[PDB]
Amino acid sequence: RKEYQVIGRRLPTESVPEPKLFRMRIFAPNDVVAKSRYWYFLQKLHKVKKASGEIVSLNVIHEAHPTTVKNFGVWVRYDSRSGTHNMYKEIRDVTRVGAVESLYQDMAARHRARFRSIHILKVVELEKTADVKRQYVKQFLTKDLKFPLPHRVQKTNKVYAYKRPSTFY
Amino acid sequence: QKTAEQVAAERVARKAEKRAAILERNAAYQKEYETAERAVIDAKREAKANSSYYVSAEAKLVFVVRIKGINKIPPKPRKVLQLLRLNQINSGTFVKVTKATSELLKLIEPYVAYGYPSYSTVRQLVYKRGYGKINKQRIPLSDNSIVEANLGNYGILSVDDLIHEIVTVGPHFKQANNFLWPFKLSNPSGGWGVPRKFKHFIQGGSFGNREEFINKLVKSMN
Amino acid sequence: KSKNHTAHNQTKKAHRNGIKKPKTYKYPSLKGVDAKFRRNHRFALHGTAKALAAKRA
Amino acid sequence: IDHTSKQHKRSSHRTAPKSDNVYLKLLVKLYAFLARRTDAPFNKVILKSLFLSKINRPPVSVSRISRALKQEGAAQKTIVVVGTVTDDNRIFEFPKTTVAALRFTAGAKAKILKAGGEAITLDQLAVRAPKGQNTLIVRGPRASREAARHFGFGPHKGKAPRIQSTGRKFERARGRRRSRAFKV
Amino acid sequence: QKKNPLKNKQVLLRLNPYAKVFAAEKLGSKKVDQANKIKPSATALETLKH
Amino acid sequence: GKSHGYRSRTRYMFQRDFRKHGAIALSTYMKVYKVGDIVDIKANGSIHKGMPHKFYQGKTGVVYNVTKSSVGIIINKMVGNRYLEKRLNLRVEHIKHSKCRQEFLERVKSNAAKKAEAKAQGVAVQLKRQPAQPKESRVVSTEGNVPQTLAPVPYETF
Amino acid sequence: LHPKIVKKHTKKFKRHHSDRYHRVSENWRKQKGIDSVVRRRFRGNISEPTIGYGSNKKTKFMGPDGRKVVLVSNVKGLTPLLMHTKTFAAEIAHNVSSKNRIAILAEAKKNGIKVTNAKARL
RNA sequence: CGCUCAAGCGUGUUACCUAUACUCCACCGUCAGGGUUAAUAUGAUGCCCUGACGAGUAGGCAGGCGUGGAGGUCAGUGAC
RNA sequence: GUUGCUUAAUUGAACGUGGACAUUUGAAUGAAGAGCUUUUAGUGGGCCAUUUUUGGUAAGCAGAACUGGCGAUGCGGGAU
RNA sequence: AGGAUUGCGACUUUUGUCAAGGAUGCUGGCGUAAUGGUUAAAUGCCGCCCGUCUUGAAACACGGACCAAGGAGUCUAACG
């Protein structure tokens, strides 16, 4: 998981020099996958392909403040067995790359949606506790939050034990 | 019988002249590679200041590796593998990149993994697993007297001079590459970094174009 | 009851031995050519034999 | 392993003679030594011809030797045959010559030595000329043999059919003329 | 017995006579470089960050 | 029973054309044919004499003989595991000149000019044909050409 | 320093179903079958003789001594092995009489030639 | 067999097990390419060097093991 | 230059005599040597898989197309 | 593995030295059933009954209770 920038162009053909340039914020494991997914989404917009064009720039976009908790709001299009549906989930994560990673896990768990059948439309960091709609996120945005962790368990590297252990905490 | 004893003193003196010629040429080729890397890195910084994007030159050389074994291979891709000298599983070559040679790689892309090497992986392959084709017969490249005897007509008077032609892609790449016997590589020490080997690099598997990550895969196999 | 026809292992048999080109030669076979042309062509080659014989002297 | 060509393939050439003759194998050893050593193309040709069979070594008539002497600038060359040299009674003026061969007939011995020639054998030739200097190799006609006419018979090849005897009432009527069905 | 240039060193020095001069001066390190300018940008950080 | 005639399965091949029926233009007859020229074959539905068999539609061959209304063309065809020589006799209406050899003669004259010209000046010719090489490095100007930020659209019902 | 002998496969190649049926002897014979598993090589079955099991050319026809054995029937047959004691050992035949063994064994021990048998009945 | 915040279902990230496959070395055979009695004891059919390859029914060719008689030869073995 | 062909012809068409131009043998890649001849064995019941596909409700049914397998083939995995 | 020397080199002020065209050095115990060989049983894993016709056999397909000797591409007239 990184958060690449892919600036394409199209070829400098005779008659029309200087093409318009096009930018996208692609998520991918490495540099080779980022260029593949660029041409995929560009092919659903303009008359271009890998033969008729070229990549100008490839830049990694690191997080500004990666040691701070943020409330993201992600829009998604995904394809089910029957058809295709639109959605709007909300995530409480430390980075954009971390938030998008956890979304692909949640879509695969509930809806059985794989990597190939998920279009990330737009990711937005929200400002105020009010814009957030979902209750499962709003639990953790309250005044003076405290809770215990009942039923702790140990993990012995050894097999046998001579105490009859407790679950106190 | 007599005077051949005196030739022992003579013949050694002429090889002392050749070692000086190798040393000065190796110093010159070191100055070419260091200036090549610095010129590209600074050229990006030149363009970035003037609100412009430097696009790098496309790869002039590519290295291929046979992934799939033998049998159950259709006749058209089997013929192309025969031309690129990848008859056995795990085999190297080097290919001079053109439009024509790129179409051959499209036909055989499920059965091979390939990418752009550097002056480091190429240096290890020619020393550790380097072998020359000398009147048929897979003969090793132990001494540089062997390379001068065969490839003395196109320059190439050393092992590093042969490496220079492969990396830079000179006028005698076709002769110099064909001289080398295909590199019989071992299986990778760490692994393939996958559960399954036949799915294409970008989806999950191993085959197809990987650009920068071929250097890591070869050094484990080397 | 019996199988009629097939073309399986047929092209595979052919490529074992060869699939070859038809050789080609300088001075091809002059057959199926116009008869009026050939009669005059014979007299031309007879006359030019006299010419080269007289030169070598 | 993708085997392009066939594996453990034979050379497809006679390495040594199939004959078990003692005196012939002595002659092979002499020329086999020279072919490795000398680096003269002449010696490698004669090494091949000593290995050949009876069909591949046809007889050279003495009239065939006389024709090669009429070549423009080849009067005194030592003509080296590799086979037998038979006598011919279709010629008269046989010139003063030098010949080298494995065998000579009783008639051909008289015809050469009457004019004042030199009937030499290949070992005696090797003493004079190791490299083969001022020589002229001659080979008899292969494809005038009685078996050669029958090879590759069919429509419409123009070859001879394999039969015992002889004229009419024997492979003439149906399939060889338009009156009786067709002309092949 | 084919040795290996990477190990052994005498077989390395049989090839590449430059291996003395490479190893002595430490070219797999080379200080190297440079001020004058840590030399900056213009409008690249707006498109990159956005 | 099975059908294996001379003009079997020739519904669309010897069909004439759309808006090109009737007579032929006179340039077809005016063209010259010497012994040596390469020629492609096209059957013409209107002309029934000297008509080729369906196999030789689109084939190419060299001319060996010439006569009043026709030209002899040898064509090599594949059968079993061995190529065979075949002799045809087609009329002028079906045959036309090939443009494959045309480009080769242009290359012969140009190379002769480059060798003769450059030897008395340049001392460097480079006359072998180069395959399409990869790119060289360059810089793209962004002045009045700023990148437009795209995004994948959501799903709609047309 | 003489090369140490390694025998590769010391176990005897028995014929298939030699122990099962009495009439089938233990002399080796190749299976020419179509249902046969010994021909096709299945896991957990008897091995077959193959050229890969052949011994080293340095030490072929040599026993534990490092000597190639020669059969001798009389005293005149000992004269090839006079100056070849380290390389060639002897062995006296079964058909030779009791008193003639003493004749051969006497002159054999003079020249220092090792006999495999003898021993010598006693 | 038994398994229930799994030893189940979807997805990710590492380690680890392992084929007669791949790399390297020993030995066997087959095939090719060389070098050599220039007196120089013992097999020129010799004596060495270098490189590749090895599944297989029907089928074809090659090199060997044994049985009964015939010609030669070890002045072969044997009532001890 | 050549002729009995062809031209109103001193034209044309075939096959030539002498002459000029070899780094740059005028795309890529490979080449395990290339081309050719004679002779004779077994075989002429086939079957399964991925796509293309006709009959049929459908079939471990019948019948074609293109490559790959089994038959002739073990070895690791799919419990078998 | 190999079994006189020959080559490429390195370190040397020099002679020489060396990890440089495949292991040498020093020490102990025993010198025979101890190491190995065959043979029988036990233990771990693996192994269906051969021959045959067949697309396909361990087959609910055919022949085989057991052993000894005998038992099947020979010779000829024209021929390639």
User: DSSP string of E1-50?
Assistant: ----SSSSSHHHHHS-TTHHHHHHHTTTT------S-----SSHHHHHH-
Count Cβ atoms below 10 Å from residue G9 Cβ, excluding itself: 13
Contacts of A147 (CB under 8 A, 6+ apart): none
Q: What Å distances lie between residue B137 and A155, B153, B157, CA to CA?
A: 62, 21, 21
F63/chain B closest Cα distance in angstroms: 34
Residue–nucleotide distance: D39 CA to H36 C1' (Å)? 16
CB contact under 8 A, C20 and F72: no
Strands in chain G per DSSP E: 68-72, 88-92
Of residues 32 to 91 in chain B, which lie within 7 A of strand H by their beta carbon? 69, 88-90
Nearest to G94 by CA among G78, G109, G114, G116: G116
CB A57 within 8 A of CB A65: no
Write the DSSP assignment of F36-102 as a string of letters: T-EEEE---SS--TTPPPGGGTT-EEEEEEE-SSEEEEEEEEEETTEEEEEEEEEETTTEEE-STTH
Phi/psi of residue F134, nearest 5 degrees: -70, 180
Place of tokens 């070559």: B93
Q: What is the CA radius of gyration of chain E?
A: 22
Nucleotides of J under 7 A from a protein CB: 1-3, 7-11, 19-22, 37-39, 46-54, 57-59, 66-68, 78-80
Q: Do F83 and C22 touch (CB under 8 A)?
A: yes
What is the rounded distance in angstroms from the CA atom of residue D149 to the CA atom of residue A87?
Answer: 90
Tell if the CB–CB gap between F152 and A7 is shorter than 8 Å: no
One-character DSSP codes across chain B: --SHHHHHHHHHHHHHHHHHHHHHHHHHHHHHHHHHHHHHHHHHHHHHHTTEEEEPPPPSEEEEEE-S-SSS--HHHHHHHHHTT--SSSB---EE--HHHHHHHHHTTTSEEEE---TTHHHHHHHHS-EEESSSSEEE--STHHHHHHS-TTS--SHHHHHHHHHHT-TTHHHHHHHBPP-BPPPPSS--SSS-SSS-TTTTSS-EEEETTHHHHHHHH-
Helix (H), strand (E) at residue A110: helix A96-110
Query: In 3-state terms, what secondary structure has residue A58?
Result: strand
Contact assignment for F149 to E50 by CB distance below 8 Å:
yes
Pairing between β-strand B61-66 and β-strand B112-115 as defined by DSSP bridges: antiparallel
Q: Which of F81, F80, F82, F76 is nearest to F64 (CA)?
A: F76
Beta strands at D84-86 and D60-61: parallel, antiparallel or unpaired: parallel
Closest alpha carbon within chain B to E47: B51
Nearest-angstrom CA–CA distance, B162 and B146: 12
Show Cβ contacts of residue G44 under 8 Å, excluding neighbours closer than 6 positions.
none
Indicate the residue of B43, B51, B57 with minimum beta-carbon distance to F142: B51
Q: Alpha-carbon distance B166 to B121, whole Å? A: 12
Contacts of B123 (CB under 8 A, 6+ apart): B163
Burial of G18 (0-12, 13-18, 19+ CB in 10 A): middle
Furthest-apart CA atoms within chain G: distance in Å: 62
Distance (Å, whole) CA B65 – CA B111: 9
Q: Which residues contact G28 (CB under 8 A, 6 or more apart)?
A: G13, G14, G15, G49
Contact between B63 and B110 (Cβ < 8 Å): no
Size of interface A-F (CB pairs under 8 A): 45
Please list the residues that pair with F75 across neighbouring strands.
F86
| Window 31-90 of chain D: CB closer than 7 A to strand H | 33, 36-37
Nearest nucleotide over every DNA/RNA strand to the G14 CA, judged by C1': J38
Task: Say which residue the tokens 């405290």 belong to.
Answer: A146
Give dist(CA B202, CA B211) in Å, integer: 11
CA torsion sign for A68, A69, A70, A72 is: positive
Peptide bond into C48 cis (omega under 30): no
Q: Are G5 and G62 in contact (CB under 8 A)?
A: yes
> Could you tell me which of D86, D45, D92 has the C-alpha nearest to residue D62?
D86
Residues B181 and B174 sit within 8 Å (Cβ to Cβ) = no
How far, in Å, CA of A86 to CA of B31, rounded? Answer: 58
**CB neighbours of residue B105 within 10 Å:** 18
Instruction: Specify which residues D138 forms β-bridges with.
Output: D81
Cα–Cα distance, F41 to F58 (Å, whole number)? 6
Cβ D79 vs Cβ D98: under 8 Å: yes
**Separation of first and last alpha carbons in chain E:** 62
Token readout for D102 is 């494995």
- Specify the 3-state DSSP secondary structure of A140: helix
Do B132 and E10 meet the contact criterion of CB atoms below 8 Å apart?
no
Cα D83 from Cα D65, distance rounded (Å): 13
